[PDB]
Each structure stands twice: as C-alpha cells, then as structure tokens.
Amino acid sequence: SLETPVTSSPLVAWYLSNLPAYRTAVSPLLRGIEVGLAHGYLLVGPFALTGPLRNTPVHGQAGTLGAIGLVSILSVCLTMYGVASFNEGEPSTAPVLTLTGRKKEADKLQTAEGWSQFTGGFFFGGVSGAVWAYFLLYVLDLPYFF
Amino acid sequence: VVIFHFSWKMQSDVWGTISDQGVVTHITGGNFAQSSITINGWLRDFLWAQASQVIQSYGSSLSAYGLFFLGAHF
Amino acid sequence: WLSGMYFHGARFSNYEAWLSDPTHIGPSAQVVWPIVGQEILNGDVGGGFRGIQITSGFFQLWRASGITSELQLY
Amino acid sequence: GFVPPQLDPSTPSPIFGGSTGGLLRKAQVEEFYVITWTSPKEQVFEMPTGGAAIMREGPNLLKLARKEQCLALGNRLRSKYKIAYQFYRVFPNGEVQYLHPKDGVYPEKVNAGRQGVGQNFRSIGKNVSPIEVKFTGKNSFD
Amino acid sequence: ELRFPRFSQGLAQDPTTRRIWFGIATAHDFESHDDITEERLYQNIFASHFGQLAIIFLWTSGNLFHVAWQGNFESWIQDPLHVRPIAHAIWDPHFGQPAVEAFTRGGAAGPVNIAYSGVYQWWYTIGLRTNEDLYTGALFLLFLSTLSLIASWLHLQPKWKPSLSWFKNAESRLNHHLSGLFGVSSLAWTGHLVHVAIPASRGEYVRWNNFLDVLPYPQGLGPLLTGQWNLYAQNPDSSNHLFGTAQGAGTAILTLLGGFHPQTQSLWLTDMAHHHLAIAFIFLIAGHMYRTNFGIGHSIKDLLEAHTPPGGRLGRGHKGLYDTINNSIHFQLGLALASLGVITSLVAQHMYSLPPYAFIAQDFTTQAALYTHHQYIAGFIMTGAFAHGAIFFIRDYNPEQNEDNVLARMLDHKEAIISHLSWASLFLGFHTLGLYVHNDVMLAFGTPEKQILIEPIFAQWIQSAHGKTTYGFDILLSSTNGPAFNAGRSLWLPGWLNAVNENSNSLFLTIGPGDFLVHHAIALGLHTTTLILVKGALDARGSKLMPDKKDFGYSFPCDGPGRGGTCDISAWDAFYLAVFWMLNTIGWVTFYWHWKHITLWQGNVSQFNESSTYLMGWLRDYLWLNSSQLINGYNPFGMNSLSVWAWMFLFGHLVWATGFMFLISWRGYWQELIETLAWAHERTPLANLIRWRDKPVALSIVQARLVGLAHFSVGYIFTYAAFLIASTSGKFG
Amino acid sequence: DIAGLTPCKESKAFAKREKQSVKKLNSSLKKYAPDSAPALAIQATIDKTKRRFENYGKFGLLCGSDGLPHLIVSGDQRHWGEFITPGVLFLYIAGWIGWVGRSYLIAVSGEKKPAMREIIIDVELAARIIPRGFIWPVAAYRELINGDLVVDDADIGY
Amino acid sequence: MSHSVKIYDTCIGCTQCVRACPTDVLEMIPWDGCKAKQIASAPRTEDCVGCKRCESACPTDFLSVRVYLGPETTRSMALSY
C-alpha cells in the first residue's frame, strides 16, 4: 500500500488517535455520549437558521426540535445497525493491532452490548447538545451573529 | 446545455434593438434572471416560446429549416 | 473546400450589393435550381437578389480584407 | 501420486513501493493468494493491478487478492521469460493450500492420474427438455 | 434457509447484494422454488387468488368511503353539469397560502382535487342518492374483504386442503363458471336493474327496507305467466324526461329502442335491463355442454379427438391437446391473458361510443381518461399473453406427447410465419412513412394540393351500411328497399338512426384521409409488435444460433460474446424488446382519439381534417398549442390549479430520461466504479469502523434491462397522463 | 361525387387556394425589376402552378371539401389514373428488377467463390443478363409451371 | 459447484480451452475417443469464474464444452473486496 504524508504522519495519527472513536482507554458509553453531544452542538446551526420558519420568532425552538428529531432518527439507525451486524455472544471485529504491533484487547466498543451503550450515550448526548445550543443561542446570545 | 445558456443569455441581456431616444428592448425582454431558475421555466420561457419561428416556417423562405426540425428528431 | 467557398462567393453571391450598405442587407451566397418547387428556397434577401441566406460569416472577412470585387474572389 | 506439494515458505518479496492495488478487508477475513517463483535475473515486470516493479534473484514471493490475477501474472511469466512457478491459497486459520499444477506438469498436456470429474458421453443435442425432469432436483445436463 | 429468502436455498448463499434483489423478483414464482410439488402449487395459487380479491375489495371500499366522507355526490345530483366532482381532501404540510387558495374548488371548505375516475356517474346511474348508501356499501365491501382473507387462511389448513384432482376437474369447473359465475350473475344484475335502478331513475326511493311491497310493475308477475310478454314494454318514458323524477316516465321496465336518452345523452335503463336479462339465459343454457357426473353432455377430450380434417392436411390434428393443456398452467394463463386483453380493448373501444352512464359524455376529461386507461391496460395484458405462451413452450411443452399435432405442426414452419410478419411490417412501414414524408415536403413548399390524400372508402361504406347518410351511398339500412331496413323500421331504427345521423354526439365520427393514414400506422404497430412477440415464442426452443436454448431456462444474460456475439437472445429479452413497441402503438392510438375528440368538442373538426395529414401539423396543432395551458401552470407570477399536472408533467420527462441511464451503460463500467468506491470507503478513517453486510455489487444484466424498462414505462405513462388530464382540464372542451 | 366530393373543375375552395397562391406570388414579384431573371423565374413559377391547377381541372379529380385533391382508389376504373395503371406499371418495374437480380445470382452461383462476384459484379455478364426484363412475367410463369422456381426440402448450404 | 461445466464426446481433443482457461479449471485426460486420445475434464469448477471464453474457442460442430450457470458465491463473482 501507499503511505503519503496524509495517511502517515505524526500529527495526523496523533489527532485521529486522540478523538473518542479510537481512545480505547475509556468506557464505550462515554465515547458515545461525547460524540453525541458533539453532533448535538453541531447540527443546531443551519437547521435553525435556514429552516422553513426562519422569518418567525419561533424559529429557535423549531430548529432545535428538528435537530432533536434528527438525532433520535439517527440513534434508531445506530441501534438497528448494531442489532443487525452484532451478535450477542460472539467476539469483536475491532482492530486489535496498533501501528507498532501491540496486540490490543478486543475493543468492547465493538461488541453488541458495547454498541448498545454507545447508541444510548449518543442519543442522550445529542439531546443534551441540542438543548444546550438552544439555551446558549436564545438566552446568552450577544457575541454571535444569527 | 452550454449553447442553450449562451443563446438565452445573449438574446435576453445583450442582443436586441435600440430606439431613436435610446431605450433598449431586447429580443426576448430580459427575463433571464427571473425564468432561468426553473426547469419548467426553461420549457415555458425559452424552449417552447422561442421554438415558434421554426414550427410556423412552412410556406416561407425558411421552410427548409422547418423540415430538418423533424428529420433531426427522427 | 476553400476554393469552392471563394467561387460561390464570386459567381453566385450578391457580395457587391452587400458591400454597398451592410446594415440591412442579408448575406446570401447560395441559390437553388428551380425544378421541384424549391424556388421558395430562394427567398427575399434584399438587394435585388434571391438565394438561401447564409450564416457562415465570410462576408465580414471579405470586407476586412478589402476584397470589394468579384474578380478577386474569382 | 508422486507429485508432492512444496509447502510455500517465507522468502523475500519483489521491490515495489506498495500501492492501491494491494489487499483489502476480504483478504484479511476470507482468503487471499500467494504466487511464488524463482527468477533468473533482476528485470522489470508489470504487476496485474497497476504499474511495474522489479524482481530479485532466487525465489520470489508476491501476494494478491484473487486467483485470476495470480494465474494471469503466471502466464505472463511463462510466455515472456520462460520460468516455472506455483501459487498457494491461505486461510485465516493458518492453512496453506497448493492449487495450480496439482502434479507439477501443466494442465495443458496429458498426465495420467487425473480422474474424470464431469463428463457426459453423449453429443450436445441429446439433452432433454425441462418438462421431462421438472419438479425434481435433476437437470438436463446431469 | 438460515436467512431470507425462505423459498430458494441457492440465493441464501449469495454474500453479494443481488441476493436481496433476486429475493424479490422470484418470490411469487412457484416453479423455481425449492421442494415444490403439483398440489402444493395449486393450493398456493388458490391462496394467492383469495389475497388478490381481498386487495381489490379493500380498494373499492376505500373509493366508496372516501367519496362518502369528503365527496360531493349528494349536492352533485342537483346539477351534474355545473359542479365539478371531488376526490378527497388535501392535507399537505408543504403548501403555501396560494396553494391552499388554488385548490379549494367545486364548493368545499379546503384544498380538494377533482375526481376524474367517473365513479360519480356510475354510482348515480344505478340510482344511489345519499351518503348513507355509500356508508352501507363501504361497510359491506370491507366485511367482504375480511371474509375473503378469512377464506385465504382457511383453505391452507388440513380438513380444507383441496387435492389436485379437484383442481384437474376442468369440466365441472367450466360448467359451473359458464353457468353460475356468468348466468346467475347476469340475472341478479338485471334484478338490481329492475327492482331499484329503473324506479329510482323514475323517482321512487326503494332500499333494503321497502322493497317488500313496491312492485316493479302495476300488475307484474303474471303477465309473463300469462305469456303475452309485450305488457312489459307498453309505457316507456317519454322523450321529454327528467332523469331525476317521473316527469314523462312510463311504466315499462323492459324495452328495445336503440336511441339515446335526450337529457342523459346516454342509454336508457331498459335497454341494459333487457340485454342483461338476455345474456343471463344465454350463458345459463350455454353452461350445459360438458359431462360432469351424469353421463349426459360432452367430454372435451372426445371433442378434441374427433376433429381431424380428412386427408390429414393438419396431420394428427388436435389429438392430445386436451392433456398438454390440462397439464400445464402456463397455457391456460396465456389463453386467459389473450382473451382478457381483447375484451378490455373492446370495453375501451365501446365506452366512448355508447356512453353507458347518465351524464358522463359531458365531463370530457372523464371520457378521455377512461379510454386511455382501459386501452393501456389492454395493451399490457396482450403483451403478457404472448410472454406466458413462450414460457409454456420453454418449460412444459412435450415433444412426444404432441407428435405431429397442430401445436408441433406450428414449430415446423416458424420461418414462414416470421418472414411474412416481417414482410407486412416492412410494407406498412415503408408506405406509411413515405406518404407522410411526401405530404410534409409538399406542404413545406406551399403546395397543399400536391399532397397525397386517400379516401377511407372502405370504412365510409361500412358506416353507410350501419346507417350513416352524409356519405349518400344509399346502401343497407340507408335505403328503403333492402329487407333489413324494411324489417327494422318498427323495432329499433328510429332511435338508432336519430343517434347515428346526429353530429353533436360521439358515435360514428366522420372520417377523412388523416384517419386512413393513422389507421395504417396503427396496423403497422400491431403487426410489428406481434412479430416481436411471436418470434420470442416460436424461437424460444432454439434457432441455429443456439439450438439447445431450451435447456437454459427462460431468462438468461446471454450465451457468450463469441461465435458472433449473443446479446439479447433470451425470450424474456424478446418480451423486453416488444414492450417498447406496445407503448408506442398504444400512444399512437390514444393520440389519434384524443386529437379527434378535442377537435369535435370545440366544433372545429375541419382543423383536424385539414392539418392532420402532415406530421408537422401534429407537432404544431396538437402538441405545441394544446400544451400551452399546461406549461404555464406555475410561473414566477404565481401558480394555478393546474400546478400539480405541470409539476407531474415535468416529473415524467425526468423519470423517462433516467431509464436511458440503464438501457445504455451496461454493467462492467459500474462494476469497476463500485470497486473503486469500495476501496475508498474501506481506507477512510472514521468510517472503516462501520462495516457493510452485503458486498456492494452492481446490478445484474437482466436486472438492468428490467429496471430500465420500468423507468421507461413509468415516465412514458406519467408524462402523457398528466398532459391528457391538464389539456382538457384547463379548457373543458 | 363519391361521398359528395365534387371535382374542382366545379368546386370553389380550389379556386380560392389558387387565387391566394398566385396572389402571394404576385405580391412577392413586385420587389424587383420587371425584367430581372429572378423576377422572370418567379413569373415562370406563377404560370407553372397556374397551369398545374388547370391540368388538375381536366382529369376528373374529385376534390375535397377544403379545396384539395383526394384520390379514389375504390377499384372503379373511372378514377384509375391514380392507382390502377400506375400500380400495375410499378409492379411491372418491380418484377423486372426482382427477376433480373434473381437470374443474375442464379447464374453467377456456379463459380469458385461467388462472393468475389457478388461484391465485384461481372459487368459483362451483368450487361448480357440485364435487358431480359421484358421476359419477367412469362419466364417466371413457365418456371412455376415446371416447378423450377421453388424448392421443397433443401434449406441450408445451397 | 457455483457454476457448472459440461463436456461432450464431440470433443476432438484439440486443447484450446485449457490454454484459454483464465483460472485453471479444465485439463485433459487420456481417452480413446479421438486421434489425440485425450478428452477434457472439469474437476476445478469451484474457481470457475463464468466467462465463456473457454467455449468461445471449441471449434466443433455446435459445441463440445458447455458452461451452465447457477447460483453465485464469493469466488465465482471475481470479488476482490
């Protein structure tokens, strides 16, 4: 295989290894809720500002509830993918070898029950992130443009 | 699509006639910026409308341009 | 091909009349034989001429190069 | 059958930068292939899945995804430089299987010892109509 | 099986995604499943028929209920010519205020669209009057659907599983159907015509309460017992009649007139009553031919045996056909599809000539929609017929059980048949295209008199014989010496002639040269589509290109690129290549009919007759102009009621185009592209964690052909349907 | 008068079409010199279409309700100068061509590789075979009489 | 067993298929039914990819080796991913 500076470099491997989807030294549920709150803070912006009620004083709650609904749909999709692909007592399929070659313990994140914890965490985190973006966009809302 | 765009843009923003006083009345009336943004518009404003002169062309000098308009399709 | 073009400009065009005033005289450089009813093809192009109107755009060139005489085309 | 396999060892690989024609998830989960040959001299040859690379002296070892590519490269090596070769299959359990010659002599020519798997001793027109065999497992060509 | 699908083990071992695809196409199929036998196949057929009937019944129940809950029937009675119908209420959370504006029409309290399916004239002709009637009918139909599903369940348990013998008992089945399903049904329909329908039209509300006392006649039930049956035709309704009440209405309940009711511009009720009372007894008698359990009657095998023209010009003749038909379903299905397609075409061709329902020949939109609907359905069924015939040849035809019989006698000279069909196609095509191009040119120069214009003299004489007078031929039924006319002048000819000679009606349209040319083009389409299908049928067993094709099953990709290349050689591929021409021919027919009627309604048939003989005339007067009301459905200045159609119109001209994407670009391209995409998604961070379950693989070749044809058909139907509705809704004339 | 179609020796819409055509032609004519060769050809076409209208008003052409000729192919030889005689003439021509081609091919079949003479015609043999057209009705006739026109069970190869 | 190969006694033992078999399926075996005393054989139909190039070569009357199609698998589909 080819190894360009993109796919192989100190800083890029460092960054990708630091984000929650690969730091196996944390419980999978916590990585799930972290990515969930990340995407929750993420999606509220355009959905609210450019929604079909933007010219209305309700556009805030509208966009936020829409974001929450999308988060719920995607959590449903996550659970469905997990129950489809992950069996309930069978082993894991996560990369158990690092770059050097340290034989890694099978990532509990890549297990049926682990994927379930991940899904629940992601859903709760998305809800929290959406409501937090709402409370920070329509109460304490001076230094922004919207 | 490039040549269609060119034809419409020219006949809607550049080409046309100039009055004695200096008022411009373009060949198509300058409806590009308000009817190029709907495919249904492309049908109505440009494709259908500006296809008249080829279809009434029978019994005139331009009648040859009419005949091909069918064989081309055929 | 170039020779055929220049010939048809020489012996079968209204090029001199077109040079007289090019504002409202349609460049025509092709006539059709009156055999099968296609006389209508030789439509009205102005300048006392009848012929299939052209759009090749040779006439602007022949006016740029100062041809201005059928002997030169010939 | 005095035609034993050779139990493909771990010998050096051809000199090649490594590129986007290598193995994928499939090779790491289901199966892959390894072709092996001895070379007469360091020359240049186009790999099946992109570009060209050089071989070394002695035995070689190339890995690939599907058997078709291995056999295509082997036919190229047999028609371009007149050298013999084998290729082996591998399973993630650790098994190794010996596939192509099955005796050492090419399947191109006759070598008694091979069985007769899949013959029908009748011309093609003698096959029967599906109605005569419907609602059964059998088919006309069986 | 260990996984979906449960009917074919061979598929379940396909880790490629095409599994799911072929896990849908080959579900209803029964031969190809694993561990399937004869009687099981028949019981499955039975359950499936019950399911289909359940579906149909739920569909019609929904129709009735929706009209009853949001329709207009009740207040539509009061003026069937100034209040548009209503289909169902709109609830669309994507509208803007002007949308809600331009949809609340016909006198409703919200956005509603206009019911065009003609269900109002149907439910009004029989005589229904109130929403409560529709509620009762909907409840009855829903209960019937539930009952049919109950049957679909019951007949798949023991103590009720019918043995294959019971299915094979063809004589008893046929006698039952021709006796009960046809005869008694017609008699019951005459009953509903003569106990509710006619008195209702005469203003007497009879229902499931009062029909015990009201007689269908002042002294009925005893004039027929008297034997002098004329007492049932004494007093019919007068020709100055109010279809809603008994003004000028008589007391006769069975007549024979032959004319059109003046007000309703349709058929009298008594005509249909008499016709059905006739057909009932016709079928009832006809259904007593075939021996079932009493030694009397006939054995169909005896009939098919006893036929052999002396001298053996047919050879062994029909010997053995009985078994090679009663042993294969696909033959029966081919016959059924053929006959059903023909009678559907017939229904289409008559329902615009003799308007059956009261006040239907006025809502022109409805007439055009119904005609086009029925014609396209007939075309599709006709294609399916030859498809399943070729399937019968591929799968169930036995050679030795049919030695020298007429069936095996067909195959021996398939070449002559295919050649002659190709000859008819070439002749019709060449000459119909020549004449068109000649007329086109001779008008392009300004000489409309030099054109070629043939007179449809044959059809004109036929019309003359039927009774048309404007041609002045003075032939049968137009002359007073012919025995027929002189024996008809007292039975039907008054009203029949009053109708056919009249012009404002739709029966027996005058015809000029354009109609001749269009009829010839239609015959071209017919013959060439027949050629495609028959070639697919006869050459299915095998030609010199692949004589052993009969061992490859019905639908296969191909037989290799060598020996000349063998793309599109399956008989499935023949049906494929025929569907195109089927759509084309039906489109031509509907074009002709729609232009003719859209000229007749505006009273300017002259324009049709003048400028319908040169193709540019069709592209100008028929498409260009008549589409101008549509393409301006929505513009930057707002929208209109026509919006949907305009939108839908474009939708067509899109889906159709997408079909091309599948008919041109074949697999290998997309296969390599999927390879690249797979590597990409595999080596991408944050996504390599998410794995796939079915290896992505581009669709198969026959699957391609199929989905491409589906796209083509969907676009080519949506486009023309939306245009046909809009062009006559924007004008209603 | 078949179905009421009067001949435009007597109808009116024909005269109206003729009048309008010659009128637009004449109005076009008055934009040049009365002697210019284009104007001369214009007047020539004017009189040509005029005499065309005249000829049509000479041969019993039953004529539509809109001012257009309309053929009568019903079989009555009264109006036969449209289909019957031109039909049999074209049938004669087509039989000519078919028979001459068939005879050429049957002749040249007897060679080493007839394809070389099917791509590159034996123009000498072609010239001495071609004018036989005057025999195509009768000759083929005798063929069918002697059964030397068709075959029974020889299908492939030859 | 995914696809299926069949060989018929019109085999003239010319050995074009094997030379053109892409994935080492066929071979020859000693027979007595032609001059070359050799007939085809398909003991390796697993790796039978399904391309007709084999029977696109057999220069016999109609054919002598047929390639009947059947269900699919991971190797009968040229999958590499």
Ligand code: CLA
């Ligand atoms: C003189 C040669 C000749 C003759 C006698 C025939 C005779 C026939 N052809 Mg035919 N054909 C020919 C040449 C000929 N063909 C050629 C060259 C072609 C390829 C373009 C075809 C293509 C063709 C098709 C596709 C079909 C026929 C069919 C038929 C039969 C019905 C007539 C028809 O539909 O034709 C229609 C007329 C034509 C197709 C025009 C072809 C005639 C060519 C132009 C004449 C060639 C003359 C020669 C090459 C020039 C050399 C002159 C000389 C000095 C050597 C009939 C047996 C049909 C059939 O099967 O009927 C059962 C049918 O479907 N033919």
Ligand SMILES: CC1=C(/C=C/C(C)=C/C=C/C(C)=C/C=C/C=C(C)/C=C/C=C(C)/C=C/C2=C(C)CCCC2(C)C)C(C)(C)CCC1
């Ligand atoms: C493939 C196949 C198939 C199918 C086939 C088909 C599909 C066919 C069709 C066919 C058809 C589709 C036919 C049609 C026919 C028609 C007809 C036959 C008609 C008739 C008519 C008549 C007879 C009429 C008469 C009359 C007149 C003329 C008018 C007046 C009245 C009267 C009545 C007198 C099957 C499955 C079997 C199998 C084998 C193969």
Ligand SMILES: CC1=C(/C=C/C(C)=C\C=C\C(C)=C\C=C\C=C(C)/C=C/C=C(C)/C=C/C2=C(C)CCCC2(C)C)C(C)(C)CCC1
């Ligand atoms: C413009 C163009 C061009 C060209 C073109 C050309 C050169 C041509 C075309 C052409 C065409 C586009 C054509 C079309 C056609 C169509 C059709 C449709 C046709 C038809 C025909 C016919 C129909 C015929 C018939 C006949 C005759 C006459 C002879 C023989 C016999 C018969 C009868 C068959 C160029 C390159 C410059 C540039 C680009 C574009």
Ligand code: SF4
């Ligand atoms: S296209 Fe389909 S059929 Fe034609 S060659 Fe390629 S594969 Fe064989």
Ligand code: SF4
């Ligand atoms: S399919 Fe035909 S070609 Fe491909 S391998 Fe099997 S035999 Fe050789």
Ligand code: SF4
């Ligand atoms: S099929 Fe053709 S190639 Fe294969 S063995 Fe028989 S002869 Fe040799």
